[PDB]
Design an enzyme around this catalytic site. Structure first.
Site, PDB file in Angstrom:
ATOM      1  N   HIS A 451       0.944  -1.141  -0.025  1.00 34.52           N
ATOM      2  CA  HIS A 451      -0.063   0.130   0.112  1.00 34.52           C
ATOM      3  C   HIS A 451       0.771   1.159   0.172  1.00 34.52           C
ATOM      4  O   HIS A 451       0.686   2.007   0.663  1.00 34.52           O
ATOM      5  CB  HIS A 451      -1.143  -0.045   1.306  1.00 34.52           C
ATOM      6  CG  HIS A 451      -1.885  -1.099   0.966  1.00 34.52           C
ATOM      7  ND1 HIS A 451      -2.963  -1.073   2.153  1.00 34.52           N
ATOM      8  CD2 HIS A 451      -2.197  -1.924   0.192  1.00 34.52           C
ATOM      9  CE1 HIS A 451      -3.628  -2.230   1.807  1.00 34.52           C
ATOM     10  NE2 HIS A 451      -3.305  -2.675   1.014  1.00 34.52           N
ATOM     11  N   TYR A 458       1.584  -6.066   6.839  1.00 35.30           N
ATOM     12  CA  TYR A 458       1.864  -6.887   5.609  1.00 35.30           C
ATOM     13  C   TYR A 458       3.102  -7.609   5.397  1.00 35.30           C
ATOM     14  O   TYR A 458       3.246  -8.685   4.996  1.00 35.30           O
ATOM     15  CB  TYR A 458       1.638  -6.054   4.527  1.00 35.30           C
ATOM     16  CG  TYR A 458       0.060  -5.665   4.397  1.00 35.30           C
ATOM     17  CD1 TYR A 458      -0.272  -4.230   4.621  1.00 35.30           C
ATOM     18  CD2 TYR A 458      -0.964  -6.643   3.817  1.00 35.30           C
ATOM     19  CE1 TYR A 458      -1.758  -3.934   4.357  1.00 35.30           C
ATOM     20  CE2 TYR A 458      -2.192  -6.113   3.733  1.00 35.30           C
ATOM     21  CZ  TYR A 458      -2.708  -4.872   3.929  1.00 35.30           C
ATOM     22  OH  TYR A 458      -3.922  -4.421   3.844  1.00 35.30           O
TER      23      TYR A 458
END
Ligand code: NA
Length: 971
Positions: A451, A458
């Protein structure tokens, strides 16, 4: 089905379904043209019966049903997202047919009519298929639906079930080997690296060993995330029986219908009539089914009892046969299978365990071909050509082992070896390359992005699985390249440094108060340690021991060598990939975090992190090793305005909430803000606080310059040029905030223990506090510091629902100074009432603690007298007057330390010098220093040149990575 037209205004979203489990089942059907229509109960999709249709070539039957077909607009308005009216059904062939079914839509259609629009369904297949087309978009140029058998085939026989008119997502009618739609997901086309590895006994053995290593991981404990493990065999037999699967004598199965979580959308389940919903609730969700398949495979591999082991094999094989017969095969779109991995991830893994069973049952090719076909959704990674997007962190989490499992299932030996060799190259490139711009992947300072910024939530799951992949492949001709191992080590050592063992609030992404923990990545440290070219890697091994709480005594049996568990890392580490730095002393870590054009301040979603505006506002969260909740970082009642270290405008939550109802990742207004380091021990943050020109709820004239110098047990915080649109009304700098509990119940103020709640007081320059976590705050420049122990009402970050809690906090009130407000204070990480008295006395002695040499819009200069280090935040290029530094020609952070015979100088810009699209390139910084110097070594890449009375240093700042040089005086 009902008497109303398909797509009827009483409920446009209510599907019309011909499932034949009602009365007058074939009322709306007229066989006519050389056909006979019966119901059979040996096979079905919804209900217990299907329509058996016997025919001769060019003959037809007709469904008499009025349709008021909505436009895509009308459909989309009715649902709330882009939609289309869809016609769908299921059909079964017991043998392949060399021709096409023609489905026609028209007014009063008989066999002699021509009339309107329709489509073709190729019948050269066996087993169930699904067909689904957009009525508005998928037809070749209404109360009649005519099904016309192939003209060029003498005779034949088709089963048809669950004829349906529905409103569907307009993205998800996919073409396949039977029907062409306007949409197609192209099949995988495998890349292949040269030269090829030969099929030899060695190379074949290495392949089989990789499969065995994978089996080992999936059967031998280690808890997988997002795997609903079930080891009790009786439970497995129970769930399996409930599937009611039986083989049919002449091919196929009958059992509960399988459907994915995404496929269900075509029915519009929540708008189905009650008769339909009850029949729809007897479907089985594929995810649960393939999870069962995996659990059985694991049980089978482990089973000691030969009879029980053979039962487990049979259950798995039958589950397999049902799955393929249900139409999960090559060339069968099933209208859609998007988000395929959520339904099938454990199917891929189960085939590793059942590889021999599938072979002997002659199912391997069919299963391989099916898995390959559905994997086309992941074509961008599964093709295995390395691209800018190949370092995808979510791939490493959700798909990487599945990809390997698929490759290992390829039947041909040479092709399997080609695939796994190419896969090794793909993973090496993915873990090695520096992706351009904000694309996913590891970065050269050890950050790791998804992102479009550094994102532990993540990266952590990706580090676990990428380390496991390297370990699976280790010491074989398919091993991951050392470049990839090295880059992953940098990132995982970095994660060890910025976690304690959870990452800070500033690194929590859209989940504040639910930080990822290094505990979840523990096994990755063992896997990466044990897959070093020279294993074990002692550093990573020592970290694994520490994180997993294992002793030196335990180390020998794990690593084959006695290794002391890592002690907590000490000193300072700059991570400008997230515009942050970490200071560590004893068991404490301080996360200093800013943001800028290249680093979003926060990720805020429709229902996540709603009040996260100040997540990166020059924060400095102190965390001792252990639970942050135990330390009073409690969401309930937390004042989101008062993030530790931040300068903020204190706002009502309705104003603090992101002004976008969905996603906002607010980036800053210039490239420069972040941190730097000196000798691996000292650090400085520089944070230029600037707001957008015109973003709703953001005061465009809110400004501050905030710098921090960190060394040993202390940090020196200074702020200048603080302003807002309203004379600094509600402008505040938070020293600390933490929940009050029996263990966190005391605040020391000026040698006095305070426990009362509520309590308020105001402090000023020369006053000191210690919070319940042992941090001392000495106020060195401020007119008004509020201290409060109070009940607080807040709201939680997901759905904004009310919370409450009791908190101790203190903040500087900047409203005493309407223009260019300022502060200074100092934190001691090992504070006691005694040590704080000593520090306050030192302060009163012409400030023996530190000296601020400059404090303006262009430069902040802090000399730390405890550590003898000076930090220089050049917010703008400037010439200055100073003993060491004369001039710096770009915004930069410079640091100096005059040791006995040397001067060490570090420099960087925290500006990554990139965009969302472009790769970061190095920034050349010229730092002129006073006097004549020569280099006190030769291992260092900073260039130096004496020029007149002074010395020109040339630093290269790549990705905000500091450089330093040890200098000695010239005579
Ligand atoms: Na049926």
């Amino acid at each position: 089905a009902t008497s109303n037209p398909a797509f009827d205004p009483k409920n446009l979203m209510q599907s019309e379904i011909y499932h034949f489990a009602q009365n007058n089942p074939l009322a709306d059907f007229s066989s006519d043209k050389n056909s006979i229509l019966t119901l059979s109960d040996k096979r079905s999709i919804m209900g217990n019966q299907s329509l058996l249709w016997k025919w001769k070539g060019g003959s037809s039957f007709t469904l008499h049903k009025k349709l008021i077909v909505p436009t895509d607009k009308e459909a989309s308005k009715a649902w709330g997202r882009s939609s289309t009216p869809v016609f769908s059904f299921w059909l079964y062939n017991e043998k392949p047919i060399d021709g096409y079914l023609t489905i026609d839509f028209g007014e009063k259609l008989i066999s002699t009519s021509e009339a309107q629009a329709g489509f073709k369904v190729k019948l050269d297949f066996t087993g169930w298929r699904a067909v689904g087309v957009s009525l508005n978009n998928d037809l070749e140029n209404v109360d009649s639906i005519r099904f016309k058998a192939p003209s060029n085939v003498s005779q034949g026989e088709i089963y048809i079930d669950r004829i349906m008119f529905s409103v569907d997502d307009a993205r998800y009618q996919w073409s396949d080997y039977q029907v062409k739609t306007r949409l197609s997901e192209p099949e995988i086309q495998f890349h292949n690296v040269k030269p090829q590895l030969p099929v030899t006994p060695e190379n074949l053995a290495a392949i089989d060993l990789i499969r065995q290593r994978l089996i080992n991981e999936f059967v031998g404990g280690e808890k997988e995330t997002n795997l609903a493990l079930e080891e009790n065999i009786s439970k497995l037999k129970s769930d399996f029986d409930a599937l009611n699967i039986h083989t049919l004598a002449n091919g196929g199965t009958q059992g509960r219908h399988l459907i994915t979580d995404k496929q269900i959308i075509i029915y519009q389940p929540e708008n189905l009539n009650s008769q339909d919903k009850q029949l729809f609730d007897n479907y089985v969700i594929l995810g649960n089914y393939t999870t069962l398949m995996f659990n059985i495979s694991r049980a089978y591999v482990l089973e000691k009892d030969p009879t029980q082991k053979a039962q487990l094999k049979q259950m798995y094989l039958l589950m397999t046969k049902h799955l393929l017969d249900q139409g999960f095969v090559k060339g069968s779109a099933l209208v859609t299978t998007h988000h395929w991995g959520y339904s099938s991830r454990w199917w891929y893994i189960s085939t590793l365990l059942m590889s021999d069973a599938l072979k002997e049952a002659n199912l391997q090719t069919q299963v391989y071909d099916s898995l390959l076909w559905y994997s086309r959704e992941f074509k961008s990674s599964f093709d295995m050509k390395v691209s800018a997007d190949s370092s995808d962190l979510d791939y490493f989490n959700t798909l990487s082992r599945q990809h390997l499992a698929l490759l290992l299932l390829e039947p041909d030996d040479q092709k399997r070896i080609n695939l796994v060799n190419t896969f090794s190259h793909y993973i090496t490139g993915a873990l090695t390359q520096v992706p351009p711009g904000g694309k996913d992947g590891l970065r050269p300072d050890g950050t790791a992005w998804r992102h479009e910024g550094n994102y532990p939530g993540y990266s952590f799951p990706a580090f676990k699985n990428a380390s496991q992949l390297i370990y699976l492949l280790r010491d074989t001709p398919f091993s991951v390249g050392e470049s990839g191992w090295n880059n992953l080590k940098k990132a995982m050592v970095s994660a060890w440094i910025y976690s304690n063992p959870e990452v800070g609030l500033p690194l929590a992404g859209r989940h504040p108060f639910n930080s990822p923990s290094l505990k979840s990545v523990a096994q990755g440290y063992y896997w990466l340690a044990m897959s070093a070219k020279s294993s074990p890697d002692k550093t990573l091994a020592s970290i694994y021991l520490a994180i997993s709480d294992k002793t030196q005594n335990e180390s020998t049996a794990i690593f084959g060598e006695t290794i002391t568990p890592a002690s907590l890392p000490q000193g300072f580490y700059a991570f400008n990939g997230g515009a942050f730095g970490i200071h560590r002393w004893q068991d404490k870590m301080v996360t200093l975090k800013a943001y800028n054009t290249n680093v979003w301040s926060s990720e805020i979603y429709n229902k996540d992190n709603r009040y996260g505006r100040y997540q990166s506002h020059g924060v400095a969260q102190i965390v001792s090793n252990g639970s942050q909740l135990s330390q009073g970082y409690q969401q309930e009642g937390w004042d989101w305005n008062r993030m530790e270290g931040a300068t903020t405008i204190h706002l009502p939550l309705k104003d603090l909430d992101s002004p976008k109802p969905h996603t906002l990742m607010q980036r800053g207004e210039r490239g420069f803000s972040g941190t730097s380091s000196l000798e691996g021990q000292y650090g400085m943050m520089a944070f230029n606080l600037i707001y957008p020109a015109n973003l709703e709820r953001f005061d465009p004239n809110f400004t501050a310059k905030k710098s921090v110098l960190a060394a040993d047990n202390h940090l020196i915080f200074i702020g200048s040029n603080i302003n807002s649109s309203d004379k600094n009304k509600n402008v505040e700098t938070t020293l600390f905030q933490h929940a009050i509990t029996p263990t966190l119940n005391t605040l020391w103020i000026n040698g006095q223990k305070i426990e009362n709640m509520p309590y308020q007081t105001t402090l000023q320059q020369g006053d000191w506090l210690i919070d319940s976590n042992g941090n001392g705050y000495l106020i060195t420049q401020a007119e008004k510091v509020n201290v409060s122990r109070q009940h607080q009402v807040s709201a939680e970050n997901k759905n904004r629902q009310p919370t409450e809690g009791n908190f101790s906090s203190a903040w500087i009130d900047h409203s005493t100074r309407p223009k260019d407000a300022s502060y200074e204070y100092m934190v001691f990480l090992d504070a006691t009432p005694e040590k704080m008295g000593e520090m306050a006395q030192k302060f009163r002695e012409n400030n023996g603690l530190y000296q601020v040499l400059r404090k303006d819009k262009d430069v902040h200069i802090i000399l730390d007298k405890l550590s003898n280090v000076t930090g220089y935040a050049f917010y703008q290029p400037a010439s200055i007057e100073d003993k060491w530094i004369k001039k710096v020609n770009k915004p930069a952070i410079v640091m100096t330390h005059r040791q006995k015979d040397t001067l060490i100088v570090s420099a960087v810009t925290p500006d990554l010098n990139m965009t969302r699209q472009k790769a970061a390139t190095p920034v050349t910084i010229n730092v002129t220093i006073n006097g004549k110097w020569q280099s006190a070594d030769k291992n260092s890449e900073v260039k130096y040149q004496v020029s007149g009375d002074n010395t020109e240093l040339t630093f290269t700042s790549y990705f905000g990575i500091p450089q330093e040089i040890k200098l000695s005086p010239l005579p």
